[PDB]
């Protein structure tokens, strides 16, 4: 485990970078949460209803 | 001289070339026909491109198609494609210039210069990519198209598209001639058509002989049916792009070709501006220094100056000849001086 | 002319069933000729003794 530990640490830092890169190119880093989506769709609907 | 040639427009047409084939791939995978792999009936799609001109203006299919096509185009690795395409272009020019330069021989020095270019581009590669994506962030949300841009897209699409057609039509005709009669190729095509309809079933994943045709002939047949459908669609889509309906920018959903090509030329120029700055000037300024420093270190540290001299045969002798004549001369000097220090 | 036999139904510019009907016809031809030559010979003068 410990021997693999450092090479694993480096690969992990990389896959964290690439995960960031697609989070940048396809989503523009827009953070999302379940309660947020729910709050906004609710409000678009309550606008509609207004 | 080379750097005085390159500048920025060459990058412009470099980027626009890859982006062009991206458009074709996107446009093909969203509008045209999919290839024929087996001899089974294909399930009948409701919407077809032949009826694209005379379609309800507010069609959720054709809308979803052009919208997913464009966002699929823009949410691509344009930053990293501009970065690699420019990298391979600069490094390829340097290797040529090297091939014609006096470093044709001396492959270690030459490798020193090539690797210097490569390490410069590879050090600068990240900032250029990510920079280009960030500068493209506004154009990913609204690549708004001006009527002039729409015109430039229109003149391109006709060229690009007929280019796709000529390669198509030649290879159909090359097929007929290679299989035999035009009528015999019409025969396997009637048979593949029959099999693609209900008229006949074959039930084979790899059919060796059906209706008296070989496994080679069934492959030539499907090939023929794919070429025919995509040939007709392409001409139609060229007549679409030359129509009065596509001259204006208002039928954007009715002219996916012109529009996708407009977005491709725009994203090309704005990414190109950044590209030239971040990366090209970086080369022109880091390259000569890196070249000199790695050459010097390589010569003085590894002693490859001496091997650089030993490498060419003509200079191996020139330096050998000079050193021998020098040694004899100095010898005769020591003899005559010895007579001088001692009279007899 | 030579061909391989992953697909013995369809060869040449001749159809699957035409090939089939041709092979039967050739066998028929050969066996008929031999049978008739052998009847004309069984009735020949040289078979009398």
UniProtKB/Swiss-Prot annotation, chain A:
Gene (name only): MGM1
Species whose genome carries this gene: Chaetomium thermophilum (strain DSM 1495 / CBS 144.50 / IMI 039719)
Record function comment: Constitutes the soluble short form (S-MGM1) generated by cleavage by PCP1, which plays a central role in mitochondrial inner membrane fusion and cristae morphology. The transmembrane long form (L-MGM1) and the S-MGM1 form higher-order helical assemblies that coordinate the fusion of mitochondrial inner membranes. Inner membrane-anchored L-MGM1 molecules initiate membrane remodeling by recruiting soluble S-MGM1 to rapidly polymerize into a flexible cylindrical scaffold encaging the mitochondrial inner membrane.
Name of the protein this chain belongs to: Dynamin-like GTPase MGM1, small form
Localization: Mitochondrion intermembrane space
